[PDB]
């Protein structure tokens, strides 16, 4: 394995490109309307929401619950993609299957929030594969609890985006997020922490070639990782609240088992 370090960065990156439909370089041209005369449809109020829903699946309750369910769809799609992505990290499939699951369990949402930043700016975010753009303010204007779910993610994304990472950076970051040695219930820690060490080692080298001026970019990234942990724990608890006191808020089974006893 000391051998596969040399192309480890390149390896992780192209797993990222292979496995994630939407990426930062794609989101960024869309959000900058430079490739196109035809911007995403803007969902900024209840009416424009209803307009977009007309595209249908191509149920049906209150507006928040409708938005809620649609997010789960993207979440499921991303968890799945991350699953494939992790299998591609050298030594991940060689791990105890009960460890392959706890790594994903605790890591998916951290990585999801990290990758979300790519489709976000201070005013909103791309949805439906970049065809839509739902505003931050609209989401905030939602009611009681639902208006509280996305906002902290915007807050994180704005600071994370100021680091100006590219996908080759982000892929490694996500890889490191995933191979975390201190997750609960991990069987053979040592092997994993060894995995961690190698990824962090190529990450740091990569940051130094890629962002030579940003001397402490790597420590900055370490703190982002801590921040993401806190973010995910908080999100986990909000989603539980909503799971308790919201009848129509059904949770897709794959996500049911992820939150199920996390934080």
């Amino acid at each position: 394995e000391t051998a596969d370090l040399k192309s480890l960065a390149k390896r992780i990156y192209e797993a990222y490109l292979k496995n994630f439909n939407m990426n930062k370089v794609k989101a960024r041209v869309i959000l900058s309307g430079k490739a196109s005369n035809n911007p995403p449809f803007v969902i900024h109020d209840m009416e424009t929401l209803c307009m977009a829903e007309k595209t249908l699946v191509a149920q049906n309750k209150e507006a928040e619950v409708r938005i809620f369910h649609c997010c789960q769809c993207t979440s499921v799609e991303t968890v799945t993609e991350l699953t494939e992505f992790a299998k591609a990290i050298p030594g991940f499939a060689n791990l105890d299957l009960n460890d392959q699951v706890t790594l994903l369990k605790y890591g998916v949402y951290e990585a999801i929030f990290a990758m979300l930043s790519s489709v976000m700016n201070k005013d909103g975010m791309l949805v439906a594969y970049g065809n839509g753009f739902i505003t931050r303010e609209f989401l905030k204007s939602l009611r009681k609890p639902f208006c509280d779910i996305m906002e902290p993610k915007f807050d994180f994304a704005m600071k994370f985006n100021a680091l100006e990472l590219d996908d080759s950076d982000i892929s490694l970051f996500v890889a490191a997020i995933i191979c975390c040695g201190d997750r609960p219930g991990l069987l053979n820690v040592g092997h994993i922490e060894k995995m961690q060490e190698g990824i962090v080692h190529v990450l740091r080298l990569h940051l130094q070639s890629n962002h030579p001026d940003d001397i402490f970019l790597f420590p900055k990234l370490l703190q982002k990782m801590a921040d993401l942990r806190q973010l995910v724990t908080e999100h986990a608890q909000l989603v539980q609240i909503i799971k308790k006191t919201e009848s129509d808020a059904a949770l897709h089974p794959l996500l049911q088992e992820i939150y199920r006893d996390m934080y």
Binding site: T83, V101, L104, L254, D261
Partner: peptide, 15 residues
């Protein structure tokens, strides 16, 4: 156990 309390996930893990 985990492999049990994480059915779908587990199934994804294996090919």
């Amino acid at each position: 156990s985990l492999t049990e309390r994480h059915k779908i996930l587990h199934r994804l893990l294996q090919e």
